[PDB]
Curated annotation (Swiss-Prot):
Family assignment from sequence similarity: Belongs to the calycin superfamily. Lipocalin family.
Record's GO cellular component terms: extracellular region; extracellular space
Segments of this protein annotated with the region No IgE-binding: 80-89
Complete-protein stretch covered: 21 to 180 of 190
Tissues/organs with expression: Expressed in saliva (at protein level). Expressed in dander (at protein level). According to PubMed:22104604, expressed in submaxillary gland. In contrast, according to PubMed:22515174, not expressed in submaxillary gland. Expressed in bladder and skin, but not in tongue.
Subcellular location: Secreted
Region (IgE-binding): 23-34, 56-63, 71-77, 105-112, 119-132
GO MF term list: odorant binding; small molecule binding
Glycan attachment sites: N32, N47, N70
Record's subunit section: Monomer.
Keyword annotations from UniProtKB, A to Z: Allergen, Disulfide bond, Glycoprotein, Secreted, Signal
Record-given protein name: Lipocalin Can f 6.0101
Disulfide-bonded cysteines: C62-C155
């Protein structure tokens, strides 16, 4: 049930797992990188904001953070503060299976894009992962810059 636009936001509510991570700056998503953050859940805060809870590593320990995301003037776009100012939007989702997010980090050193694949479960179809890899390459993210997190510690032991 792939939705490609006009997403119902309340249907992306609830728990998510981070599965694949991609960026045109690999350091951002590798171990210790500012964007190596594992989603826990998404909830509707208001008619125009979301709240994400996510895990980061702090001195080796999985640590929960909360992020407030607001609709911008552009349709489908949200902003969020983390390692600077970010703009993100949904690329596509099957609400009960997976969601793909695109993010832009707007900083003065070098702007970069992030691509994220979440699943309702700690894994999804190889069909879904293939769809994501294709999007990444269409966005000129090299395959070396796509990381599979199902192999690594994604704080699953700490989600509570
Ligand atoms: C801070 C990062 C990791 C979060 C913010 C919200 C996005 C939908 C997913 C994402 O890139």
């Amino acid at each position: 049930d792939v939705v490609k636009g006009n997403f119902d936001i309340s249907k992306i509510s609830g728990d998510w797992y981070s599965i694949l991570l991609a960026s045109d700056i690999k350091e951002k998503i590798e171990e210790n990188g500012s964007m190596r953050v594992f989603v826990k859940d998404i909830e509707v805060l208001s008619n125009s904001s979301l709240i994400f809870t996510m895990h980061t590593k702090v001195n080796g320990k999985c640590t929960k953070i909360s992020l407030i995301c607001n609709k911008t003037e552009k349709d489908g776009e949200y902003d969020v503060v983390h390692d600077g100012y970010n703009l993100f939007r949904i690329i596509e989702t099957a609400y009960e299976d997976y969601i793909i997010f695109h993010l832009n980090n707007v900083n003065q050193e070098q702007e970069f894009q992030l691509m994220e694949l979440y699943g309702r479960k700690p894994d999804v179809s190889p069909k879904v992962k293939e769809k994501f890899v294709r999007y990444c390459q269409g966005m000129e993210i090299p395959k070396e810059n796509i990381l599979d997190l199902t192999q690594v510690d994604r704080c699953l032991q700490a989600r509570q």
